[PDB]
Design an enzyme around this catalytic site. Structure first.
Site, short mmCIF file in Angstrom:
data_model
loop_
_atom_site.label_atom_id
_atom_site.label_comp_id
_atom_site.label_asym_id
_atom_site.label_seq_id
_atom_site.Cartn_x
_atom_site.Cartn_y
_atom_site.Cartn_z
N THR A 1 42.81 -72.75 11.75
CA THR A 1 42.91 -71.64 11.36
C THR A 1 42.99 -71.39 9.71
O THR A 1 44.07 -71.79 9.37
CB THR A 1 43.91 -70.77 12.26
OG1 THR A 1 43.85 -71.08 13.55
CG2 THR A 1 43.71 -69.04 11.94
C1 LIG Z 1 51.54 -74.06 25.83
C2 LIG Z 1 50.05 -73.77 25.51
C3 LIG Z 1 49.53 -73.72 24.36
C4 LIG Z 1 48.08 -74.03 24.61
C5 LIG Z 1 47.07 -73.94 23.43
O1 LIG Z 1 47.03 -74.56 22.45
N1 LIG Z 1 45.97 -72.92 23.45
C6 LIG Z 1 44.97 -72.89 22.70
C7 LIG Z 1 43.69 -72.18 23.30
C8 LIG Z 1 43.16 -72.51 24.55
O2 LIG Z 1 42.98 -73.43 24.63
N2 LIG Z 1 42.23 -71.54 25.30
C9 LIG Z 1 41.21 -71.80 26.56
C10 LIG Z 1 41.23 -70.86 27.26
C11 LIG Z 1 41.49 -69.34 26.35
C12 LIG Z 1 42.18 -70.04 25.19
C13 LIG Z 1 41.30 -69.62 23.75
C14 LIG Z 1 40.50 -70.47 23.31
C15 LIG Z 1 39.47 -70.15 22.20
C16 LIG Z 1 40.00 -69.02 21.66
C17 LIG Z 1 41.05 -68.15 21.88
C18 LIG Z 1 41.63 -68.48 23.20
C19 LIG Z 1 45.20 -72.61 21.38
O3 LIG Z 1 46.22 -71.87 21.20
N3 LIG Z 1 44.28 -73.01 20.20
C20 LIG Z 1 44.91 -72.58 18.66
C21 LIG Z 1 43.94 -73.43 17.74
C22 LIG Z 1 44.09 -71.09 18.77
N4 LIG Z 1 42.96 -70.60 19.55
C23 LIG Z 1 42.64 -69.62 19.05
C24 LIG Z 1 43.66 -69.09 18.02
C25 LIG Z 1 43.94 -67.77 17.47
C26 LIG Z 1 44.63 -67.79 16.28
C27 LIG Z 1 44.72 -66.61 15.62
C28 LIG Z 1 44.33 -65.33 16.37
C29 LIG Z 1 43.56 -65.48 17.35
C30 LIG Z 1 43.52 -66.60 17.84
F1 LIG Z 1 42.95 -66.87 19.35
N5 LIG Z 1 44.66 -70.14 18.02
N6 LIG Z 1 48.08 -73.84 25.84
O4 LIG Z 1 49.14 -73.82 26.51
#
Ligand SMILES: Cc1cc(C(=O)N[C@@H](CC(=O)N2CCC[C@@H]2c2ccccc2)C(=O)N[C@@H](C)c2ncc(-c3ccccc3F)[nH]2)no1
Ligand SMILES: Cc1cc(C(=O)N[C@@H](CC(=O)N2CCC[C@@H]2c2ccccc2)C(=O)N[C@@H](C)c2ncc(-c3ccccc3F)[nH]2)no1
Ligand SMILES: Cc1cc(C(=O)N[C@@H](CC(=O)N2CCC[C@@H]2c2ccccc2)C(=O)N[C@@H](C)c2ncc(-c3ccccc3F)[nH]2)no1
Lengths: 223, 219, 215, 215, 218, 223, 216, 222
Positions: F1
């Site tokens: 990010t």
């Molecule tokens: C505890 C714990 C932590 C995590 C973790 O690292 N979870 C990951 C996210 C993930 O695996 N999943 C799968 C299903 C939906 C969700 C997703 C995927 C893609 C996009 C948006 C949401 C994360 O947090 N990965 C980080 C690098 C991230 N993904 C998006 C952001 C983000 C940053 C700023 C503003 C909005 C955002 F969504 N951050 N899981 O359990």
């Protein structure tokens, strides 16, 4: 830190050094470690400065609180008890580094014989307390050197003057062998503080008197 | 409600009516408390803080409760800050608040009348302060004397006639006791007397009992 | 119910009627608080916040409680958000809510009448605000002046026939003290919310300064 | 039981009758709130949610209580699910429940009468909703207008005579101030609209030169 | 004691009497709910569980509180055990207990009258059940219909004389409407729902607008 | 990010990439990381997706809540305070792995000078906040690449167009040196997101605009 | 408010006026407690602390409650501080506060009247102290003796013309019984105890049975 | 970070640098660390930024809270006690890394001799405090360098301007030996901040005078 207390016919004296250290660094040169806690009682503390100040203030406030509520001061045994409770309450914080041990000097006005009414109480971190019945006591990092000096000097105590003399010399030996205990600063003019207690009450010994004793001791050690 | 508050005010007023009189005077050495008290160990006047004293008229257990609450407030405030941040005006204020809550909320109103006095700290120039707190929380600052308990108008009117600023301890004692009896034979066996002495270095509250009180009364 | 509210309203109304009177006015330099107060150490007028002031009439311990609650509200709200988020309208609102609750649920209703005033911040041009909160929690906004406590009709009318906007300080003091007599330093407590001050607007006018302002 | 509830219902009825009147009507652009309010700072018409508006009559501190409670309920509901799930019917429902509990169980029943309006979301075509909740928790569904506070009968009759659907903003405003006149300029009115033409937040206030221009 | 219960029973009873009438009718397709309702979105009839429906007369916020409570009880029990363990008798029972506590201990009694109905699960042959719970917690088992609110004698006699168990949805509807008229009427002033025994899981179904208009005229 | 924000004469612009990873796997290609929190403020977050969404939703709801309750929006300082208090609230879960930092960009309608009313506020896990007074700021795993690119590109910022372009190019550099930041995807049509804020409020920048600027950067680096 | 407080006050007054009488006197050896008690195992006079004793008149379970409360207070305080810090003045103060609270708030006021007496510690010279607390927390200090319960004024008179300071124990009990009669008493009808200032630690001591028979 | 305070005849002065770091990286060039906490009290802080801002804001709000509630400001011992109590309150977070220590400097309006009315109070993590009676003090990662410079340069303090010059020079040395303390940035024009407190209150030192003193020091050491 080194705090000394000793009995003389008709009273008790307590003196303390002025040094504050933080590891090896000298963080204080004029600390006042002996407090008059009521008209006949004085407490001197060794250890963490915060816990020492909280002990002194809270203890004096407690005693005067009791005598204002009940129109009569606590017995000396009661004072020992409250102080021991306060020390015991700090045990958790003491195990985590905030350790402070107090030393109690007083004149029991309700004592049978006023010549031996002087009282010295020592404490440990567990709240355990002991009324000293061998004349003198000391708390702090240099307390062993101080007690061992007073063991040789105590036979000279015959009144308040000799008692204060022996006390200041014990502090002198404490600072002589303990780098955490501060000796007389003849350049800045800073000397240990002292409180004397007899049947007239508890008074702060004036600076110039302790300076006189310190100079006499130094010139005695130089010759 | 309104009737209840009325008869509460009447119960307290009548209770204080049947009570013995206390007066507090400003004089050269500070403040003097004198109270009609035949007792030996039950005191109506007490030390509050270093330079703050306390006088009370009415039901003993109630103004003793208030006395202890005042000592608690003063000591706790002094430990939280400094001894010098404790003022008589503070004690009078929290006494007004507490007596208001007591008057409206307790099962029975307190049949008490309070006076808090403050003299100057050692070496400082300040004219004494005197506060009166009523059973209903009414607070008033008065500059010279405070009368509480019993039939007050005779005693107060007497002090209005015979008060002099910076009168000696002997003069203030004679004037106080004269006004007392004038409101209604008394002596050392019937008086509880103390002073807030602006000459003492630390604790200004000082009792005058026994031989000293006898020597002060008659000259 | 109707009997109890009758007795609460009447008790508070008579209690406020027996108390001395307080006047607050807008003037060219800010807001003027003038209160009949013979006491030396007890106050009917107080600072609440930077540009927000408090005046009260009635039973002292009760409006002092409310005054302390107002200071706690303003300080806590400023620390929670920012000092410039604290307004006089907020304090007026919370005083109306609180006073309503006291009037309906406390053992005895508070015999108080409260005024919250607000001047502009330093270097800003907005006109002062005057809020009046009565014993039952009723709130009202006045544009010119607020009278509280005692027999309010003669003082109110006097101001209505003497008030002029943007009056000088001395003019506001004379018009206020004149309206009250319907009175020197030892029987008056006077303070202003001075919009010309940079940080804290509240300041008392006492002693020789007040005497010079009187005549 | 009958004694208490009788006294409470008549205390609240008397309280509402002594207050100024509010009118709310559905017009071609959404919903129009107009309330007799001589205050420059105190408001009787508020926003609850994106397309949900609030208008009260009676005792200010009490309906401001209910107002903040409605805003709380709305924001919490929208955070627990989504903004779109918040409906004016929900607000009216929980207002009926709330005012029921208050009316039966509080120290003094609330002297208030509430109205909750909903317009459609931007792209949608949905006829407005007007809900009127009374002091005892009674809730009524109205299709055209809602009148609260004061002597409501002449206003409801003048509206029953002079109201037509889909009037312009100026028509609705004028017939509204007319219906209020049967029992009034910019300085003594508070006017706002839920404008279905706005994309996000429908609530909008008509004040100052704009309100004067519409009259 | 004795006066308090007299004014409570009188307050609640009279409160229900001043309200609009509601009729619940067992018919060949299940159960039929018809209620006088001028509102478009405020409802006196509601789903409780799969085959269990709810109808109420009186003060809206109160029987809506009881409505939400009933839905909470049904969903909680069905979650703790199985959906097949939630029955109309259970709902009516907890309503009797709850309304008893309300009548005895609330600051003011509830001016409500409840009916809980249950049809059979899909594919099964069980005749409908109708329970009536009144303002004081009295529970009653009624065979064919339940009238609540207003003056229930004219509607009850009309239904007693014009009732057919195996009547159609249209027939039973116009019967209930005719009885409601006898106790004092189109789509704009009626709330109508049905416990339809033929739906596979959730038997509750509302009847609105043009569909109801088609059910009122031939 | 990577989240970037920068002031321009009369306003402020913020932009964020669209990548989500877990480990080395690309798990997201069109994440929205910059949110319009009210008419004059936008916040872009970096970190745990759950904590970021909670921050943005709860913060917008908080601001509009205060505005509806008190009839006036919070002062910008108050907004900073609430956001910081929220982050400090999440401190513990951040210490156990749910960490997420926000970057705040707003327009102060109550500022003295209307062309320098743009505001950039950066935050840390402990609730500390700093109003940036150098023109630009970034937060995320590619924040130092983007910040060092803006250090050189900032002098070209003179209005909304230039500032937006140098924001898109800072994101481009960040994505170029940090595999956890996504660059423009010309095959899919996915480009970074941006908000611009002036005295007329906060508006989203259409994607096609960022696509134009993206292509301009790419060819400008091809030759 | 006022009529309710006078109804309570009278209920307590009539209750105490119906109960048996109790006397506590000061004599050269300490304090003497004499009470008309038909019971064999239920006590109206009891020990509170080393030199502090307790006498009571009225409804038994209520002054027993108060007695247990005073014992609790005394022991707790002596533990928190020292045993020498417990004084009869303190227990009279706490009893005053407690009876005032009970009188003002309890469902029924306590129909009791209490006396707390303190003598000097061993080897100390100090005249005894006697305090009397009534049903509304009124507290009074009495230099010679306390009479409470039943018809009091008759007993008070006999004491007024029969009391002699520093009287012997054998004289003092005889005097006390004489005053109790005015308003024949033997061992089977009496309960008696003393605060014996000559005792090193605990001064309270019951005078029962053959020792009381020999005393009378 | 380095905060310095020293007493001069008739008042006291405090000054702090502008740097914020995070490990080795420069994360701040304009951080304002010396706060005017009340009309006669200024607080400088070193350590975690969030704990610092909380300390300053909450502390000033607390002092004014008492002043408005009781109509009189706290005594100086009261202010000391309150600050020490707050610092003690943050001891758990301090043990887990959220450490920040204040240095206090104020003018006591109730002091005996108005020339010796200056006050400097140092604090530790457990709320222990020491009223400094040797004239000067410093807190932060460069405090030893600033104290060891002020030891040699204190003799030149004779009035307000000289004490301010000594404070700026001490901060200069601290920045010279401690990479966490920022010195004068002659390119950006960012200089240490300073507050001075005399019998007329606590005022901000204007930046221009700090800049001139800094330029004199730089010119003298070239
Ligand atoms: C505890 C714990 C932590 C995590 C973790 O690292 N979870 C990951 C996210 C993930 O695996 N999943 C799968 C299903 C939906 C969700 C997703 C995927 C893609 C996009 C948006 C949401 C994360 O947090 N990965 C980080 C690098 C991230 N993904 C998006 C952001 C983000 C940053 C700023 C503003 C909005 C955002 F969504 N951050 N899981 O359990
Ligand atoms: C946890 C933790 C421990 C410490 C710690 O060791 N803190 C040191 C003290 C210290 O560095 N500072 C600097 C700022 C003010 C404070 C100070 C200086 C001088 C005097 C009084 C207080 C200490 O505890 N040093 C010990 C050896 C000490 N210093 C004085 C006493 C003392 C002892 C008895 C009676 C009164 C006293 F003040 N004890 N800090 O956090
Ligand atoms: C745990 C933990 C530690 C930290 C941490 O290292 N936090 C850092 C600060 C930091 O990285 N950021 C970025 C966003 C805002 C915040 C900032 C930056 C610059 C200026 C002011 C605030 C810190 O504490 N860095 C220390 C060296 C520091 N920075 C300023 C001060 C400071 C000192 C005295 C008075 C006022 C102050 F702000 N201290 N975060 O969580």
């Amino acid at each position: 830190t080194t705090i000394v207390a000793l009995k003389y016919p008709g009273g008790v004296v307590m003196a303390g050094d002025r040094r504050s250290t933080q590891g090896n660094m000298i963080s204080g040169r004029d600390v006042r470690k002996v407090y008059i806690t009521d008209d006949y009682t004085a407490t001197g503390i060794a250890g963490t400065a915060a816990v020492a100040v909280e002990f002194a203030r809270l203890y004096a406030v407690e005693l005067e609180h009791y005598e204002k509520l009940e129109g009569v001061p606590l017995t000396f045994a009661g004072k020992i008890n409250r102080l021991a409770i306060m020390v015991r309450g700090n045990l958790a914080a003491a195990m985590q580094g905030l350790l402070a041990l107090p030393l109690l000097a007083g004149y029991d006005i309700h004592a049978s014989d006023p010549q031996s009414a002087g009282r010295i109480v020592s404490f440990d971190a567990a709240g355990g307390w002991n009324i000293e019945e061998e004349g003198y006591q000391a708390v702090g990092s240099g307390s062993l050197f101080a007690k061992s000096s007073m063991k040789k000097l105590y036979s000279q105590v015959t009144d308040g003057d000799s008692g204060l003399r022996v006390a200041v010399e014990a502090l002198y030996d404490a600072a002589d062998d303990d780098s955490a205990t501060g000796g007389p600063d003849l350049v800045r003019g800073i000397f240990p503080t002292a409180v004397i207690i007899d049947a007239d009450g508890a008074v702060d010994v004036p600076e110039s008197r302790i300076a006189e004793l310190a100079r006499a001791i130094i010139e005695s050690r130089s010759g | 409600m309104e009737q209840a508050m009325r008869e509460r005010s009447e119960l307290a007023r009548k209770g204080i009516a049947r009570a013995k009189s206390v007066v507090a005077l400003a004089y050269a050495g500070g403040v003097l408390f004198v109270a009609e008290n035949p007792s030996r160990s039950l005191q109506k006047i007490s030390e509050l803080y270093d330079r703050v004293g306390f006088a009370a008229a009415g039901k003993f257990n109630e103004f003793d409760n208030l006395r202890r609450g005042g000592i608690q407030f003063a000591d706790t405030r002094g430990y939280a800050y400094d001894r010098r941040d404790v003022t008589g005006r503070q004690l009078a204020n929290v006494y007004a608040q507490t007596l208001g809550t007591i008057f409206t909320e307790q099962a029975k109103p307190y049949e008490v009348e309070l006076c808090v006095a403050e003299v100057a700290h050692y070496g400082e120039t300040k004219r004494p302060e005197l506060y009166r707190i009523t059973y209903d929380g009414s607070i008033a600052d008065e500059p010279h004397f405070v009368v509480m308990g019993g039939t007050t108008e005779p005693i107060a009117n007497a002090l209005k006639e015979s008060y002099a600023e910076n009168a000696s301890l002997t003069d203030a004692l004679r004037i106080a006791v004269a006004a007392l009896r004038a409101g209604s034979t008394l002596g050392v066996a019937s008086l509880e007397v103390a002073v807030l002495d602006a000459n003492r270095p630390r604790r200004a509250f000082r009792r005058i009992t026994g031989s000293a009180l006898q020597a002060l009364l008659v000259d």
